[PDB]
Amino acid sequence: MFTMKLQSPEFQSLFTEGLKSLTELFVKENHELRIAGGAVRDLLNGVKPQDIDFATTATPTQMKEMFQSAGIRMINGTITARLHEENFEITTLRIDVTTDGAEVEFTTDWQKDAERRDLTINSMFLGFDGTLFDYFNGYEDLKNKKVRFVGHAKQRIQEDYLRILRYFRFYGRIVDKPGDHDPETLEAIAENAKGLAGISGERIWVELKKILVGNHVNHLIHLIYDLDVAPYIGLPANASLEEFDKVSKNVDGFSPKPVTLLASLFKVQDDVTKLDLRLKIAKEEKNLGLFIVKNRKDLIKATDSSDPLKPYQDFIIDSDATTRVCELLKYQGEHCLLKEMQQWSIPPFPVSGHDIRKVGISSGKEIGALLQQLREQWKKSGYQMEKDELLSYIKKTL
């Protein structure tokens, strides 16, 4: 028969020498291997996936044995094999066992493993021929832009409260015009938001960062506040949503770091330190937040000036600074200054003691006095004058 199979440049680009060797090994050893989960959703949406999860009927012991006998190196129910300088993370199909005191049972039933997954658009498998295995209407849901739980929203949320944030993230990722949400899902989120207080800051921060750099971040942050999710994920309860609205417009299209956008919710430095206590963020992330909150009102472009970028250049010359300044320029919506700053090479002071000796000066004190005069001119020019102009200038002084 003829049947529908996926074909695209995004799918084709996955078939590296490693992947071809892996798929041939599993065929040879009579174990089914398929792409699973988020990679499938990405492929169906026309995007090459990264960090693919592969799924198999082989148990972890069978995979170990097979890789061992085939001379294939393993790294790290999941086994990671390395073939042709590429890693492949492969997980045995499983069913969760209900316990009072976490346990799974391996299975070869693809439909049972699909039923374990959260959202219908993430519950699908793809064969390497392009056959789609879809047990929960995920394909139709994806096409209709519906973000829906496998089974009942309340039950799936109460199994892992982080799925509240996943709902938001995938909604941003697939929806075109935001606004339509299933009321049973919103009800489930609002009633169970408090469950997020029991989830690690690390897990939350991973998802929140994806929401912040993803599409429809304005809609989603508003919904997070509107459903009272915000307090349980380390966000201040009384944020300036007006500032967030301005800043989200400012950074749109300019690849903000997640903390850049999050800082528009912070009134004071203490909100960064409170967020850190909850979400356990990296030093770089915290310092970025403090930098923006500290400098957003005062470190601003010069107006009626020869170089509007001069205050920012000063801050950089006087002292990681460039990254922080560029984020600030995004935050402030200074689109016509952002790229200039990204492309600005920090110039050293271009005049040396020797340059002054060459114009006839011999005294150390006099050389230092002249260099100081030249540093001031150089800084005054917005760090733009070069050696000859500066030396020309000093010869006049003399």
Q: How many CA atoms lie within 13 A of 220 on its CB side?
A: 27
Amino acid of residue 26: F
Considering the complex, state which of residue 76 and residue 343 has its C-beta at the smaller distance from its own copies: 76
Reference 55, options 133, 3, 121, 118; nearest CA is 133
Rounded Cα distance between 79 and 61, Å, is 9
- Stretch touching its own copies by CB under 8 A, among 65-73, 130-138, 214-222, 340-348: 65-73
Report the residue from 124, 153, 189, 199 that binds Cl ion according to the rule CB under 5 A: 199
- Stretch touching its own copies by CB under 8 A, among 247-255, 305-313, 326-334, 360-368: 360-368
Considering the complex, state which of residue 8 and residue 384 has its C-beta at the smaller distance from Cl ion: 384
Per DSSP, the three-state class of 277 is helix
Angle, helices 163-174 vs 183-192, to 10°: value is: 140
41 is in an annotated binding site: yes
Map the footprint of its own copies across residues 324-353, applying CB under 8 A. 352-353
298 is in an annotated binding site: no
Is the Cβ–Cβ distance between 199 and 243 less than 8 Å? Answer: no
Q: What is the DSSP letter of 196?
A: G
Report the residue from 58, 188, 217, 367 that binds its own copies according to the rule CB under 8 A: 367
Considering the complex, state which of residue 177 and residue 354 has its C-beta at the smaller distance from its own copies: 354
Give Cβ neighbours of residue 389 (< 8 Å, ≥ 6 apart). Answer: none
- Stretch touching its own copies by CB under 8 A, among 67-75, 114-122, 209-217, 274-282: 67-75
71 is in an annotated binding site: no
Q: What is the DSSP letter of 267?
A: S
E strand residue ranges, the chain: 33-36, 53-56, 73-75, 78-83, 86-92, 94-97, 103-106, 125-126, 132-133
Report the residue from 73, 152, 194, 375 that binds its own copies according to the rule CB under 8 A: 73
Considering the complex, state which of residue 139 and residue 315 has its C-beta at the smaller distance from Cl ion: 315
Reference 227, options 187, 172, 167, 184; nearest CA is 187
Report the residue from 8, 12, 155, 200 that binds Cl ion according to the rule CB under 5 A: 200
Q: Report what 283 binds from Cl ion, its own copies, none; CB cut-off 5-8 Å by kind.
A: Cl ion
Rounded Cα distance between 149 and 141, Å, is 11
300 binds its own copies (CB under 8 A): no
Where on the chain is the footprint of its own copies (CB under 8 A)? 68-73, 82, 352-354, 356-357, 361-362, 364, 367
Annotated binding site for ATP: 38, 41, 117, 160, 163, 166, 169
Annotated binding site: 38, 41, 51, 53, 117, 160, 163, 166, 169
Annotated binding site for Mg(2+): 51, 53
